Amino acid sequence: KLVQLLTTT
Amino acid sequence: KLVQLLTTT
Amino acid sequence: LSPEQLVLTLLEAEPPHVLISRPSAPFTEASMMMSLTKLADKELVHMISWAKKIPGFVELSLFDQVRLLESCWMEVLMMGLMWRSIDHPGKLIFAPDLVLDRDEGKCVEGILEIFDMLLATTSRFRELKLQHKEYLCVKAMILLNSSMYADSSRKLAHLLNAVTDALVWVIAKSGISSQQQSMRLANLLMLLSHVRHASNKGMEHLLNMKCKNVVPVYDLLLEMLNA
Amino acid sequence: LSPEQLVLTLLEAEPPHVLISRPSAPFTEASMMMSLTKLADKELVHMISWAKKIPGFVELSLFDQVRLLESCWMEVLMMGLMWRSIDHPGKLIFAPDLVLDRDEGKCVEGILEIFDMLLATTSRFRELKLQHKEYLCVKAMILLNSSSSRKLAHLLNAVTDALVWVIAKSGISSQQQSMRLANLLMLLSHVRHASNKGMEHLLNMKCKNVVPVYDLLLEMLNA
Ligand SMILES: Oc1ccc2cc(-c3noc4cc(O)ccc34)ccc2c1
Numbered sequence: 001k002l003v004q005l006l007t008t009t
Numbered sequence: 010k011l012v013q014l015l016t017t018t
Numbered sequence: 019l020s021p022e023q024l025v026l027t028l029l030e031a032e033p034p035h036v037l038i039s040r041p042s043a044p045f046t047e048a049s050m051m052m053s054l055t056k057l058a059d060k061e062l063v064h065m066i067s068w069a070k071k072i073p074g075f076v077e078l079s080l081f082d083q084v085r086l087l088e089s090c091w092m093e094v095l096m097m098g099l100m101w102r103s104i105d106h107p108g109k110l111i112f113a114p115d116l117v118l119d120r121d122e123g124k125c126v127e128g129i130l131e132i133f134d135m136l137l138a139t140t141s142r143f144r145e146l147k148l149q150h151k152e153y154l155c156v157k158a159m160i161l162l163n164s165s166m167y168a169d170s171s172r173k174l175a176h177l178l179n180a181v182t183d184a185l186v187w188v189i190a191k192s193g194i195s196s197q198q199q200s201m202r203l204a205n206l207l208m209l210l211s212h213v214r215h216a217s218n219k220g221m222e223h224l225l226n227m228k229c230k231n232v233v234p235v236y237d238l239l240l241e242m243l244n245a
Numbered sequence: 246l247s248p249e250q251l252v253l254t255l256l257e258a259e260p261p262h263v264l265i266s267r268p269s270a271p272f273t274e275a276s277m278m279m280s281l282t283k284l285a286d287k288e289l290v291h292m293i294s295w296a297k298k299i300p301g302f303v304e305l306s307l308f309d310q311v312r313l314l315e316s317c318w319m320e321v322l323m324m325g326l327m328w329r330s331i332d333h334p335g336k337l338i339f340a341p342d343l344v345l346d347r348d349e350g351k352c353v354e355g356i357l358e359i360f361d362m363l364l365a366t367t368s369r370f371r372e373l374k375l376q377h378k379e380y381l382c383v384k385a386m387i388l389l390n391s392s393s394s395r396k397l398a399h400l401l402n403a404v405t406d407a408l409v410w411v412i413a414k415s416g417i418s419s420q421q422q423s424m425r426l427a428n429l430l431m432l433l434s435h436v437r438h439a440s441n442k443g444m445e446h447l448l449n450m451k452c453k454n455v456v457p458v459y460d461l462l463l464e465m466l467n468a
């Protein structure tokens with residue numbers, strides 16, 4: 001969740 | 010004991 | 019990239035204002051924690067976007083970016099809380115539709131302590147007349163200086179240095195004395211310890227709540243908590 | 246009382262190093278917890294005398310003196326530790342004959358993490374090349390900032406002014422004086438965090454029975 005938001009816009 | 014050291018000594 | 023331009027990019031990185039959509043009404047123990055956790059969760063999403071807008075943050079390894087946010091998320095939320103409450107002595111403006119007194123924090127055990135820490139520090143920033151631009155640098159510094167500790171690491175220090183240098187500049191523009199400038203920088207930085215202290219207490223309390231399954235821990239807030 | 250006199254006063258008030266011997270045999274969970282606690286207990290006694298020598302501390306209400314000390318004792322102990330370990334990368338000098346290695350922190354569940362923060366923060370101070378005079382001011386700020394109320398604020402500014410005067414006497418540019426002031430103070434958070442993890446750990450070790458928590462050490466632990 002944290003990681004997927006860090007890698008997407 | 011804390012109060013003692015602060016005021017007694 | 020001058021200090022002024024870096025501060026401008028932080029201003030542009032500021033997240034949007036959040037509301038919990040709660041029809042104004044008296045707060046009970048269930049609705050209060052429900053409101054706090056639901057809001058923290060929404061804000062966490064915007065915090066990630068906010069962080070990626072800080073020049074150079076995305077250029078850090080994923081391990082660092084993750085570790086820095088897992089470490090400071092609670093402090094950045096509280097720092098945002100204090101800025102918003104600065105103009106309202108006695109109150110904690112979590113959100114326009116979520117405003118609490120010290121008496122409301124009484125219904126929930128262990129919370130009155132945390133609110134008092136937050137109110138005292140908000141009160142402290144209020145007598146120093148924390149300026150918006152100062153708020154921006156300070157909040158950024160919390161992120162970059164949160165977690166305790168080669169290519170990525172040097173970038174962090176370089177990035178943290180940049181923000182430090184931005185805060186010095188802001189203070190410099192206030193035009194005050196050089197002695198007063200140094201005194202103000204120290205007074206603002208010394209409060210970082212207090213923010214970190216309330217943070218440790220709030221997560222401790224939140225963690226106990228999670229274990230009791232009394233709060234609807236949401237996916238994002240959940241992993242940020244467990245981390 | 247000029248900044249220099251405040252520094253000079255803090256330098257005299259430095260407590261004497263508490264001498265504690267490292268156990269004969271290789272550390273066990275208990276022998277380590279009893280060493281660390283015995284040393285901490287003895288140092289607390291000196292810390293209280295030290296605090297009474299900080300200009301204007303004794304002028305605060307007794308209740309505030311108690312709150313400051315209960316709130317910062319571990320930070321002060323850790324700041325002392327870090328300073329004693331500054332010229333020994335990789336090591337934590339808790340005392341002359343008790344020089345703990347980072348690896349020795351394994352004979353105790355969860356203390357390695359605390360040791361790592363200490364070593365991490367120490368390296369940061371080493372890198373900044375912290376000076377004795379800066380150290381004196383910083384440690385006193387920790388105690389005065391764990392925060393009659395107006396008298397504490399002028400006390401904190403007095404020491405802040407001293408730290409500012411000490412750094413200024415180094416000759417680095419005015420811009421770099423500000424940067425160094427910032428870099429030194431940012432580390433206060435780290436110290437406060439370690440203090441938090443360290444006290445939570447200690448309280449835990451007390452509940453486990455892993456080591457008897459002395460009277461003074463217990464009062465402080467509970468606050
Ligand atoms: O913008 C925000 C949103 C939520 C927040 C929650 C707490 C908080 N402090 O202590 C607690 C204890 C809890 O159980 C739950 C939440 C908290 C503190 C600051 C906040 C700022």
Ligand SMILES: Oc1ccc2cc(-c3noc4cc(O)ccc34)ccc2c1
Pocket residue numbers: 278281282284285288322323325326339356359442443444446447448450
């Ligand atoms: O001068 C001193 C004396 C004792 C000290 C103990 C700890 C410490 N850190 O984590 C712990 C956990 C414990 O259970 C007991 C002690 C500690 C840290 C710094 C110290 C500095």
